[PDB]
């Protein structure tokens, strides 16, 4: 498994390296790895496949369809290489097992993630670990790889990172995080519509079609506990229950209607021989939503989703392979202790003025005002104190914003008074209660730490009852 | 003197600013940050491969007329 | 009528790949994927003992047997739809017959002689021609699809809509033995890359020695590329300094990541080719995977 010189042949040998994700860029990388000579691989990914011939995968089949997306590679590969030592792990990253200690037995990092918290999540346990991580992302033609070390290079979070209008759309989702993900799966199935063709034997009927991808389909997904160990499970829906019991978000009850007028309207389309026309569109808003209720996700409008639906950058399986090919040799350089050397190469549609389509630029230096990778990091959160609880401060502020995993946090006073607990079954009687009942209100410090990111972030607190329609809490700074 | 400069996105996109010489590139970086609808330090923009800092002119910069400054956005698909 | 029409042009192309090496894998496994109405493998050679790994289309137990034959399962198990097929005899003594059933033909591993017949056999059949290959650390790919149209949509310019295009390719024979006696050659030759150069001295490796430069014969093809760099440069009254010393070192056998890199820009440009839908890079791609650089360079005319 040689081409290049006998130290760096050994290092690549011997070294064992992390890939997380196992989507379109994972799958790619794992191959190019083992074909370079990388014979101790760890690959983690925690969705399972869904693929069709409307979009195809590298190395996943129809005769893959619901099963681990990690193992399957692993699987795929080992056809290639039989040598090769793949552990594969059908889980989330963010699983308190893959710790610090986790992430000191690998010689390198490479990221292959579609979202922001794990990225996060990763880029703080990499530095925790003093070991190199390589970040990637694409979209459409366009992509960059970089490398992060601990006290040389800029952390992913040195920069604020633009907010998403464009979505890239990646490697068929099938357990949801992002809302974007249920639009993208609802625009998936729009045209694979319009059993893999059930609608084309049951006669196009909105309630049997209800009872399969939204009843049996998540109900075959919960005999694997693998996923519903530490993170929210998926509530399964029935058709005769939701029955039971514009910008505007409305109930589960008018979405299921929705998705049944869509339906009845959207089949006189289909008697003849897009997105523009509204029935199209109200197939997308419902079947997304739907889908969103499932999973512990709060539901979007019309108005939001027919925006985000349009911002889909479609895939290009072309450049996935680009990217997974320069992060291979990005660690080549690493691995030959060459990192000054390393570049963020970003990728182009077509040649600048200079001539180039691959744009290599210097690795920047650490960010001294970084809320993360800097000495003693603090920042600043204005909020309502009499109408935000623990319970909000907890999912949507200390760990959703500020992307924490298991935090721990107490008030700055000489005392140490502990608000959140991650230990289970300490701090479980707060979460309703007002954070103006523990003393807290303008000038209050909280000290929240995290022990699995090894990370403290210091929180002042400026209160204000003026905020606005639907704002609990607003980041200055 | 002023100069016409073209500031040309990875997606091809191209924008056209008319900008004084004495004047900080900072207000041609917060512009455009401003119609991307995206924050400051969210893209880098290079000339000669060089990153315009916000404290940067175009005289300092030897920038010519019609000279092209290149815009660079992370993907985090 | 509109870009579902190029999507389309592209589900109804035939396409020829040459080389079923690691360049080849990667640029079959692309194509394929895309949904090409087909596409047939070309590859005269047998498996050796080391590329059943290497080559990720070949099974281990396959050595022996017609590396193209060896690929046909793998590869056309990624796509059912395509319409894969192979071909087991020697591109050299292949009649012109053969390649008007192809609307785009790429090569692999083949020798400049082939390379530029090909290439002339195209242009005269309105065929669309492509070649590339990995040397090492440096891949490159060459296009050439002579009077082309295209419909790329141009972005909003203020101080997005479709627009047609025609650009003019041309032979690589001209591509390949440029001229730089000229005046305006003079003052391309510092913005061109040593890449280019550097072509021109593997190739002239491939045409005398049979094979690329090898890891198991380093010292000696190491020598013979130094003296090609000589006898090349000085022929084309250009300074042999633009080339330094240590090129042989990155520039031996065939590097995974490097097919990967060059197999999914070229694939994708012959994806742009047959749809008509992108603006197709002019000419050369140039990759260094020591370097990161990725540059588009237009020589020829
Ligand atoms: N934008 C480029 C496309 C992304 S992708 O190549 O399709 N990869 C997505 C792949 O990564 C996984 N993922 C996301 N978040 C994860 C956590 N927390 N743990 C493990 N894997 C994770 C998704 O499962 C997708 O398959
Ligand atoms: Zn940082």
């Known amino acids: 498994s040689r081409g290049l010189p006998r130290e760096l042949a050994e290092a690549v040998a011997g070294g064992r390296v992390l890939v997380v994700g196992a989507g379109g860029i994972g799958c790619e990388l794992l191959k190019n790895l083992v074909l370079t000579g990388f014979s101790h691989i760890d690959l983690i990914d925690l969705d399972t496949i869904d693929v069709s011939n409307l979009n195809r995968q590298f190395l996943f089949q129809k005769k893959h369809v619901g099963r681990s997306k990690a193992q399957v590679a692993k699987e795929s590969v080992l056809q290639f290489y039989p040598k090769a030592n793949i552990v594969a792990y059908h889980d989330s990253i963010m699983n308190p097992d893959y710790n610090v200690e986790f992430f000191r037995q690998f010689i390198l990092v490479m990221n292959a993630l579609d979202n922001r918290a794990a990225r996060n999540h990763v880029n703080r346990m990499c530095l925790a670990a003093d070991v190199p991580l390589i970040e990637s992302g694409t979209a459409g033609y366009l992509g960059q790889v970089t490398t992060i070390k601990k006290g040389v290079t800029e952390c992913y979070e040195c920069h604020p990172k633009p907010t998403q209008r464009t979505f890239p759309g990646c490697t068929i989702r099938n357990t949801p995080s992002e809302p974007i993900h249920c639009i993208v799966w609802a625009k998936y199935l729009f045209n694979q519509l319009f059993t893999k063709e059930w609608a084309k034997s049951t006669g196009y009927d909105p309630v049997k079609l209800f009872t399969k991808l939204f009843k049996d389909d998540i109900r075959y997904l919960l005999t694997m506990d693998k996923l519903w160990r530490k993170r929210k499970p998926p509530v399964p829906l029935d058709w005769a229950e939701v029955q039971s019991q514009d910008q505007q978000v409305l109930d589960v009850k008018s979405y299921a209607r929705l998705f049944s007028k869509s339906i009845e309207t959207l089949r006189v389309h289909l008697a003849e021989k897009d997105k523009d026309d509204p029935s199209a569109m109200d197939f997308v808003t419902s079947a997304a939503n739907l889908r969103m209720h499932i999973f512990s996700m709060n539901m979007k409008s019309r108005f939001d989703i027919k925006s985000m639906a349009g911002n889909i950058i479609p895939a290009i399986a072309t450049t996935n392979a680009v990217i997974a090919g320069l992060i291979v040799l990005e660690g080549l350089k690493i691995l030959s202790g060459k990192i000054d050397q390393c570049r963020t190469i970003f990728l182009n549609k077509q040649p600048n003025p200079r001539k180039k389509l691959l744009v290599p630029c210097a690795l920047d230096p650490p960010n001294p005002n970084c809320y993360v990778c800097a000495s003693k990091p603090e920042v600043t959160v204005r909020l309502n104190v009499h109408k935000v609880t623990v319970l909000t401060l907890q999912d949507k502020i200390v760990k959703e914003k500020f992307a924490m995993v298991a935090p721990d946090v107490q008030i700055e006073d000489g005392k140490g008074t502990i608000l959140i607990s991650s230990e289970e079954g300490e701090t479980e009687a707060n979460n309703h209660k007002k954070l103006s009942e523990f003393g807290i209100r303008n000038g209050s410090r909280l000290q929240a730490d995290d022990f699995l990111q090894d990370y403290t972030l210091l929180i002042n607190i400026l209160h204000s009852e003026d905020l606005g329609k639907d704002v609990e809490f607003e980041v200055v700074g | ?77 | 009528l509109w870009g579902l029409e190029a999507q389309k042009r592209l589900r109804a192309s035939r396409v020829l790949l040459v080389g079923l090496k690691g360049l080849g894998a990667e640029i079959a496994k692309n194509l394929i994927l895309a949904g090409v109405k087909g596409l047939t493998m070309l590859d005269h050679e047998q498996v050796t003992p080391e590329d059943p790994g290497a080559q990720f289309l070949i099974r281990t137990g396959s050595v022996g047997r017609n590396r193209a034959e060896a690929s046909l399962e793998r590869a056309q198990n990624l796509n059912p739809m395509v319409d894969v097929k192979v071909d087991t005899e020697d591109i050299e003594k292949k009649p012109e017959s053969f390649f008007t059933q192809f609307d785009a033909v790429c090569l692999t591993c083949c020798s400049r002689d082939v390379i530029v017949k090909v290439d002339q056999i195209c242009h005269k059949n309105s065929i669309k021609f492509f070649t590339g290959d990995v040397f090492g650390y440096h891949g490159y790919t060459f296009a050439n699809l002579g009077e082309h149209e295209f419909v790329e949509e141009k972005t909003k310019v203020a101080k997005t809509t479709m627009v047609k295009k025609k650009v003019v390719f041309c032979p690589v024979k001209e591509a390949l033995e440029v001229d730089w006696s000229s005046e305006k050659a003079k003052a391309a030759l510092k913005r061109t890359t040593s890449d280019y150069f550097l072509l021109q001295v593997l190739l002239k490796f491939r045409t005398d020695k049979g094979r690329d430069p090898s890891s198991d014969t380093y010292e000696e093809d190491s020598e013979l590329l130094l003296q090609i760099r000589n006898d090349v440069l000085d022929s084309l009254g250009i300074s042999p300094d633009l080339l330094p010393e240590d090129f042989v070192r990155y520039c031996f056998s065939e590097m995974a990541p490097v097919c990967a890199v060059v197999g999914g820009i070229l694939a994708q440009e012959i994806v742009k080719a047959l749809s008509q839908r992108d603006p197709p890079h002019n000419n050369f791609f140039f990759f260094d995977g020591m370097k990161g650089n990725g540059i588009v360079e237009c020589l020829g005319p």
């Not at chain 2, 500031?7 to 041609?28: A, N, R, Y």
């Not at chain 2, 991307?36 to 002119?57: C, K, W, Y």
């Not at chain 2, 175009?58 to 400054?69: N, Q, S, T």
């Open chain 2, 1 to 77: 003197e002023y100069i016409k400069l073209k500031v040309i996105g990875q997606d091809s996109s191209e924008i056209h600013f008319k900008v004084k010489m004495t004047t900080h590139l900072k207000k041609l970086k917060e512009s455009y940050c401003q119609r991307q609808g995206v924050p400051m330090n969210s893209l880098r923009f290079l000339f000669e491969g060089q990153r315009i800092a916000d404290n940067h002119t175009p005289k300092e910069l030897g920038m010519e007329e019609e000279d092209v400054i290149e815009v660079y956005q992370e993907q985090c698909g």
